[PDB]
Design a protein around this nucleic acid. Structure first.
Length: 1308
RNA sequence: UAACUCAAUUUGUAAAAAAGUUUUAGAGCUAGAAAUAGCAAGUUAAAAUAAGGCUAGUCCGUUAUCAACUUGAAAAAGUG
DNA sequence: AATAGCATTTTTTACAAATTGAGTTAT
DNA sequence: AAATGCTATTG
């Protein structure tokens, strides 16, 4: 017979259902393979498939890239040791050996146990002399004394091993705050007597370098400068000091929007363009700002002078040490005096987050400071210690989270010192001073990637030499350019219309030309004389470009109607019917090159344009000046420096969507003009790009089609890989159902798809940039930012009257949606305006009145600049003053509310339709045997709420299956009752408020009570009956009442990390796992808690007693992710090695996670691991009870059904008890559930329902979970033994579950 | 459906950084047969950071994909 | 069996591709 | 961001 398919596609569940003609889902009696009593079983063709969320590639990428860093840092140290090799031997036989075995216990050590000197006395003395590595570093930088070759390696290696960041370009130097601010002032002063600025020199070191941020410290630095805008030149010179990218366009009235970034590798190149345009006399402004900006950077990383020591970092680290030494000594005597009884807790007990916990225990700085703060202020004579603790400067370590600020510049400055000292004493240091710096310096560029040799899936570089790559021969042995090119060319699109070809760059002239002449051709004009607006003159367009478009970047219709009509075609008033504002397509690259080339002869002529295409392609391709430099040398012979050196200055972003071939090249023989040249003159047709292709008169739409894997297809979908998993299983589900129907494709298919830590870092960052005074009466809670009344008030200034909404008034203050809930159903937040009242926003029957937009738009551009909300929020917000949600704007919001427009879903549709519709007809046209209907995600949600088919998720997993049914129902109906919409829902080929009245009344044809609808609703053409509100509305009721629903959970081998990542200390346990072959976890610790990949059923024997008497056994052994590859290679040896004797190789059942077992009384179990099970049972509460628990939780007429038919409780609790006692088996907890029910019967009607919905966690399928029953938590009763399963009935489901092989595990 | 303009999320890749943790090294001191007392110290470093693998690279090693049965190296097909 | 503690973090630069949602043009 | 299989301890 005929049938359809419904599908409910989520990230964790594909729901599926089959309906026949009478909206009925058939049963069907499938075989049962295996060795059980059952040969057969009748299942309904409804069900779901559950599965664990698919995951993104980020965690593996972060770890993969982290592992590339570790193996490099190692070779970074190896490069150093290789240098020191031959000379170190002469000093110490095996110094490098003693380091490499540092970690080994004394018992397994080959050399002395003291790594540095190889005996006790020297080593003890080394530490006594230089208590921190920084001491040695400093002393090696200052002292001129010939140093020990081992202490030189140990300073160099420390500087190389942890070498700080590569964020800042160029060479900053410790040249530094107030005495460099005076130089900026005196520079800006003696450039400008006439505009004078002064502040003397007192409070400079603080107002910049205070407790608060860097951006808000410009407001307390620059606003102190009375009669200067901080957004002027001297501000923008203090702006560069903090670390901004200002644009000095206005300041020196320069036409080009010149922007300078100080850390950028482009700044010295960006310095030349501003001085050569402003003069050389203004150099001392930048060359005195970079001094102060340096200061700004160093001022937070180092607390020393540079006048005494040439190692200001290492020195500054010693300073922290000595303060750490003093502050300790003091706090030692201060405890011995006032609280000598609490000395143990603070200095001896590691456990408590005291000092003793701070050092030898796991107490961080933040944790330690939070436990001493109340003991400081109590104990008098600790004034500075609180000042330190409140400045984060109390008892610092030299190795701390906030060492991230130190750039490699600072460490290289010291590494250079040491070498410059000891080369005088060591010949190999003098010769290799280049190499030893370069090991610190060199840094594989991101546009090269893994230095691989055809064995890295991810790599892409090109090898110029095949020899090994070192930091010193890199540019010799790697083709950096070619690699740098391939980095981009392996990601940018091909031409859709010609897949073999590659898209041109978004700023290519030949492209730029095409964009305009496609937008220009359709511009129609009307004057005083003309009677029907005439389209643009094919012949005359070449002037409109040369006159208006080649002249400026932006072409204005206002600057195109006024300039052209009035000065070209003696035309008074100019009305433009094609476009009314600024043109989208600009020739900007023509006006961008014409300023730099200063030749409209070369440009405009274009007798050879192929040279200029490379130039602009190179500017888009690379971002490194160094890369761009060489690449542009090919065309230096035509231009001097100022013409070919400002071309390294120009940089371009983006790629085009169309190739060069298509645009200019692929022509027609009949035509004899390209798509660009045909756009420039099409006579009296002036046809478009989309025209030019598809016009059957032209040969293009053929050429394109004629010149033009499930996993690949699904992979290629743009969408969360989490949804890409539901999509693949959907297609498998479908593939299987079709086979169940004797390989007979369906009539239709209906698809459907659903939709604190982030806050903390976003709010803190925002609170650092804002200057809000949050904290004054807004204490911190890391979690409670998910409070929506708290997140939207804050985001202390209320929206309606532009005042301050109170905390009690923030609960009473309304929250309006940006657009009424009728136009767009969107998450409350990104349209989440809270007003004093709704009566401020205006009429709810459209978008807010112009009056409030006229009123507040001047403030709406003060938070768009602050970037609080997207600019598309301000488009609708300002749409009252722009236009206003018209009766077409509303009809389109009410049409898209039911029609799926999301691209993922369309593809799901394209994929499914393509797979069903394979056969063709007489005239090469496709046969559409199966119709795929995409339905939005609120038809059924309404259909259920409207017609008493309510959903309660908590009860069981049927909702996903039920939805795929309803989705099938509505889908076949809305296609029967409106067949004209098979171009709107199906995949394949005042009147605005009348399209609205269609869309918004489409679903009313189900009803019976609108203000009188007929009983049998029919077709608007055929005599086909489509909905029989008498019969069909009780078949739907019937289906949701069906208790046997096919629920299946994907069986999945586990992948990912070997174990928990925590490196635990040494311990006596076989649960520890060695981090390294010869690293006995008795001695060295390791990991525990490995993830098992899958279990296997071993049937074999094990030796018993000293007799080695084989005793037979049958148990589950967990093959861990790390074990796995070993066990698969040779399962017998792996298992024999485990102690198993005479393994039955035929009986080794592979058991991945979620394997279902049927035990007795239909009690079912899913193995979660070798030694824990989870609830494999699903409870079907009858439909009667479901609708009760929804209303009981929660127009007037069905309320009475709650009070009446009440006490559905007593019978619910029962069904739960009868289930919990049969399959769950959590005696104590079911006795606490009952015991807590009976003592809450005097609690309201709703409350008892709200806790029964909490009760289903007990009976829910999957892992036991804790849950509350009123004010009584109920700890999870887990299943921590698989013994029972070993003699149960392993069930092998098919993806639907309709096919089963059941194996009774009474093997042995 | 296509190009176009403007501004948000999602996905994928590469290059870098700072910590954390683990063992060792940094002679603890007296008093006591010992348990235990008193006190002195404490900030640093080396090395490991998936076990590892062969393709031996300054590469690869945590994504995706997985009922059963028969057939296939696999992909996949066939089976009610 | 009931019971309880446990889980590696954070930061920067560079690029590409779709999507979504406000506009002009056309098939 | 929880959520849930390890780990160990208990009478």
């Amino acid at each position: 017979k005929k049938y359809s398919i419904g599908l409910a596609i989520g990230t964790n569940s594909v729901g599926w259902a089959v309906i026949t003609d009478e909206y009925k889902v058939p049963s069907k009696k499938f075989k049962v393979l295996g060795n059980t009593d059952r040969h057969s079983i009748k299942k309904n063709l409804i069900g779901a498939l559950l599965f664990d969320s698919g995951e993104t590639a980020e965690a593996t990428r972060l770890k993969r890239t982290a592992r590339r860093r570790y193996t490099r840092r190692k070779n970074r140290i190896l490069y150093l040791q290789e240098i020191f090799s031959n000379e170190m031997a002469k000093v110490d036989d095996s110094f490098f050996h003693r380091l490499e075995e540092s970690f080994l216990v004394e018992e397994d050590k080959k050399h002395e146990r003291h790594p540095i000197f190889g005996n006790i006395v020297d080593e003890v003395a080394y530490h006594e002399k230089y208590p921190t590595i920084y001491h040695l570093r400093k002393k090696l930088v200052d002292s001129t004394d010939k140093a020990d070759l081992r202490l030189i390696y140990l300073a160099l290696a420390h500087m190389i091993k942890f070498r700080g960041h590569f964020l800042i370009e160029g060479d900053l130097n410790p040249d530094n705050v107030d005495k460099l601010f005076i130089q900026l002032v005196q520079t800006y002063n003696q450039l400008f007597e006439e505009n004078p600025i002064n502040a003397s020199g007192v409070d400079a070191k603080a107002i910049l370098s205070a407790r608060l941020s860097k951006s808000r410290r410009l407001e307390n630095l620059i606003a102190q400068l009375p009669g200067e805008k901080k957004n002027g030149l001297f501000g923008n010179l203090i702006a560069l000091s903090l670390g901004l990218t200002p644009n000095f366009k206005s300041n020196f009235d320069l036409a080009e929007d010149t922007k300078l970034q100080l850390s950028k590798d482009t700044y010295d190149d960006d310095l030349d363009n501003l001085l050569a345009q402003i003069g050389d006399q203004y150099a001392d402004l930048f060359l005195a700002a970079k001094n102060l900006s340096d200061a700004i950077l160093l001022s937070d990383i180092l607390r020393v002078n540079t006048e005494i020591t040439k190692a200001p970092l290492s020195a500054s680290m010693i300073k922290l040490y000595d303060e750490h030494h003093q502050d300790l000594t003091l706090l030692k005597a201060l405890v011995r005096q006032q609280l000598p009884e609490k000395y143990k807790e603070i200095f001896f007990d590691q456990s408590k987050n005291g000092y003793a916990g701070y050092i030898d225990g796991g107490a961080s700085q933040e944790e330690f400071y939070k436990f001493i703060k109340p003991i400081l202020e109590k104990m008098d004579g600790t004034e500075e210690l609180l000042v330190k603790l409140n400045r984060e400067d109390l008892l610092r370590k030299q190795r701390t989270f906030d060492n991230g600020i130190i750039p490699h510049q600072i460490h290289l400055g010291e590494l250079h010192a040491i070498l410059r000292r000891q080369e005088d004493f060591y010949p190999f240091l003098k010769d290799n001073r280049e190499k030893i710096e370069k090991i610190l310096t060199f840094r594989i560029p991101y546009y090269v990637g893994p230095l691989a040799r055809g064995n890295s899936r991810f790599a892409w570089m090109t090898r110029k030499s095949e020899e090994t790559i070192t930091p010193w021969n890199f540019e010799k042995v790697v083709d950096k350019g070619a690699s740098a090119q391939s980095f981009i060319e392996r990601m940018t699109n091909f031409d859709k219309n010609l897949p073999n070809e590659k898209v041109l760059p978004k700023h290519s002239l030949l492209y730029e030309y095409f964009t305009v002449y496609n937008e220009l051709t359709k511009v129609k004009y009307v004057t005083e004389g003309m009677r029907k607006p005439a389209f643009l003159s094919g012949d005359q367009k070449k002037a409109i470009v040369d006159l208006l478009f080649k002249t400026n970047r932006k072409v204005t219709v206002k600057q195109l109607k006024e300039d052209y009509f009035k000065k070209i075609e003696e035309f008074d008033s100019v009305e433009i019917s094609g476009v009314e504002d600024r043109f989208n397509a600009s020739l900007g690259t023509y006006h961008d090159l014409l300023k730099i080339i200063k030749d409209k002869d070369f440009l405009d002529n274009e007798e050879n344009e192929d040279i200029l295409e490379d130039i602009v392609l190179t500017l888009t391709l690379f971002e490194d000046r160094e890369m761009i430099e060489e690449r542009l040398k090919t065309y230096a012979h035509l231009f001097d420096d100022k013409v070919m050196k400002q071309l390294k200055r120009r940089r371009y972003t983006g790629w085009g969507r169309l190739s060069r071939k298509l645009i200019n090249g692929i022509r027609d023989k009949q035509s004899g003009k390209t798509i660009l040249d045909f756009l420039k003159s099409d006579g009296f047709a002036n046809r478009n790009f989309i025209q030019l292709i598809h016009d059957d008169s032209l040969t293009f739409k053929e050429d394109i089609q004629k010149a033009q894997s499930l996993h690949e297809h699904i992979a290629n979908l743009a969408g969360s890989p989490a949804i890409k998993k539901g999509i693949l299983q959907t297609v498998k589900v479908v593939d299987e159902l079709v086979k169940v129907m004797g390989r007979h494709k369906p009539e239709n298919i209906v698809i459907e798809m659903a939709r604190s830590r982030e806050r903390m870092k976003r709010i803190e960052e925002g609170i650092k940039e804002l200057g809000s005074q949050i904290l004054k009466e807004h204490p911190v809670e890391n979690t409670q930012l998910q409070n929506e009344k708290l997140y939207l008030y804050y985001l202390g200034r209320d929206m309606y009257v532009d005042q301050e909404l109170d905390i009690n008034r923030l609960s009473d203050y309304d929250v309006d949606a940006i657009v009424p809930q009728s136009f767009l159903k969107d998450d409350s937040i990104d349209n989440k305006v809270l007003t004093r009242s709704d009566k401020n926003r205006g009429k709810s029957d459209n978008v807010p009145s112009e009056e409030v937009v006229k009123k507040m738009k001047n403030y709406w551009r003060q938070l768009l600049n602050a970037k609080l909300i997207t600019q598309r929020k301000f488009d609708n917000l300002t749409k009252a003053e722009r236009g206003g949600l018209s009766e077409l704007d509303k009809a389109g919001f009410i049409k898209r509310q039911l029609v799926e427009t999301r691209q993922i879903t369309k593809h799901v549709a394209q994929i499914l339709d393509s797979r069903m519709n394979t056969k063709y007809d007489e005239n090469d046209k496709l046969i559409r045997e199966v119709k795929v209907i995409t339905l939005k995600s609120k038809l059924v949600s309404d259909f259920r709420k409207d017609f008493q088919f309510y959903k309660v998720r908590e009860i069981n997993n049927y909702h996903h299956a039920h939805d795929a049914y309803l989705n099938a129902v509505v889908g076949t109906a809305l296609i029967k009752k409106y067949p004209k919409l098979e171009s709107e829902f199906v995949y394949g080929d005042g009147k605005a408020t009348a399209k609205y009245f269609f869309y918004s009344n489409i679903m009313n044809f189900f009803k019976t009570e609108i203000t009188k609808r007929p009983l049998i609703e029919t077709n608007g053409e055929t005599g086909e009956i489509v909905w029989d509100k008498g019969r069909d509305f009780a078949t739907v009721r019937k289906v949701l009442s069906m208790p046997q629903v096919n629920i299946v959970k994907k069986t999945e081998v586990q992948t990912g990390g070997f174990s928990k990542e925590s490196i635990l200390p040494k311990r006596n346990s076989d649960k520890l796992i060695a981090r390294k072959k010869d690293w006995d976890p008795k001695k060295y610790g390791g990991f525990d808690s490995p993830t098992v990949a899958y279990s296997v059923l071993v049937v074999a024997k094990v030796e018993k007693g000293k007799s080695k008497k084989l005793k037979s056994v049958k148990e589950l052994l967990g093959i861990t992710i790390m074990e796995r590859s070993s066990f698969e290679k040779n399962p017998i040896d792996f298992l024999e090695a485990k102690g198993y004797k005479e393994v039955k190789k035929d009986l080794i059942i592979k058991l991945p996670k979620y394997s279902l077992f049927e035990l007795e009384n239909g009690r079912k179990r899913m193995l979660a691991s070798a030694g824990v099970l989870q609830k494999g049972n699903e409870l079907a509460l009858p439909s009667k009870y479901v609708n009760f628990l929804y209303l009981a939780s929660h127009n007037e007429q069905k309320q009475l059904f709650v009070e009446q038919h009440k006490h559905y409780l007593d019978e619910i609790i029962e069904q739960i008890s009868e289930f919990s006692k049969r399959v769950i088996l959590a005696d104590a907890n079911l006795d606490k559930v009952l015991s807590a029910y009976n003592k809450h019967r005097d609690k309201p009607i709703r409350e008892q329902a709200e806790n029964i919905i909490h009760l289903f966690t007990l009976t829910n399928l999957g892992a036991p979970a804790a849950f509350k029953y009123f004010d009584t938590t109920i700890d999870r009763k887990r299943y921590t033994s698989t013994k029972e399963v070993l003699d149960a009935t392993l069930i092998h489901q098919s993806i639907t579950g309709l096919y089963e092989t059941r194996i009774d595990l009474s093997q042995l």
